[PDB]
Amino acid sequence: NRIQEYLQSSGLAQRHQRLYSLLDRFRLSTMVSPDKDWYVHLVKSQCWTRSDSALLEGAELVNRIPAEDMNAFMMNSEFNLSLLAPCLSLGMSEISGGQKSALFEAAREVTLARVSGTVQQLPAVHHVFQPELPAEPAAYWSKLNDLFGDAALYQSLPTLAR
């Protein structure tokens, strides 16, 4: 039961379905209308995750929700920040066609909002980054080691720089 639970509690059961089927086979041997709210929920399932397999398609799905709801969609946490680059890339593609992009305007105001947001966490006073021995100041360098050493923070930087 623990083995079965662990496989299902992770993606291994989906990755290895044949093993899970065999284990379960051994286990038994032992004895609605598609409205706007539905669309928002569906894209919410795909565009609120950490998967980067389909971002070009995720950009189009978020491109179709109402413009007024676009801002709250991207500002809200658990939104894939990897989608911002496709969102700006696709939104610009129709600006280049002459139209007004609700997506691009809602996306650039999200990128700068996050760029400003992660600057507030930087130290108030900036010192020259010394690759050799960044240890002469104590509080400042210790303030970066727990900042650049955070997976939730460090991963957020290049995915926002893109």
Binding site: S51, D52, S53, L55, L56, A59, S82, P86, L90, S93
Partner: protein, 279 residues
Amino acid sequence: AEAGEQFGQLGRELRAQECLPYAAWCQLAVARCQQALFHGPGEALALTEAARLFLRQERDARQRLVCPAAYGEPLQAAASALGAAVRLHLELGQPAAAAALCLELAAALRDLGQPAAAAGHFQRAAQLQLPQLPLAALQALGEAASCQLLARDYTGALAVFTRMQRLAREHGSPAALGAFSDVLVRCEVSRVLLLLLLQPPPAKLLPEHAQTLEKYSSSGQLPEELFLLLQSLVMATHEKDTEAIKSLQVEMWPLLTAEQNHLLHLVLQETISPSGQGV
């Protein structure tokens, strides 16, 4: 005869004062004198010297001092002289010397920022060398493949890599002879990366590429760690597990050359962000 020596010392003096365009012109003059004397080796040497002087001119105008006013002007004269020298060599035999001159021209073009023409000249040199020096031809084709990867001609690079693998297998054997084993390893890794990048359909999937992809789904001459990482990469790109390619790309970085690191980066990039969509 005496006119040739006069032009020779003129060119030597002009190169002494570093007015090397006129030194190359004097080398062309002494090459013409050798033509009048029907001395093929001397004419080939004179044309080689003139081409080298012109190439140094273009290098100075483009590498030493990067002059935006330079429009590759002495490069044309260098190419003309080198073509004349290659034609003379071939008409007197010695395809190895012509291949060497073509390699020199291809290297010059590659340094000057023209990967496509460099790859073409490298392939020409390899074709000139292939009947007699298969290992030299393989090295020239490797330079051609590197240049084609520089010019972002990924399918041409894949074709060149496949040709090199075939030539190495059919000439360096069964196990390779070391000097061909490294060529085969480079061919295998580069071809695997290029096939993961391009992802040919069944119509374009040649039997050789299909066999190579089958091998990665045991290790001929690849190190076991590199072979295992390549197999993991192939499975991940067939599975679309971007985290897997990210972890592998971090892991295989020290084991790959800069060229292969670039190819793996391209594979990862085309995985997350496919090209051709227009966005």
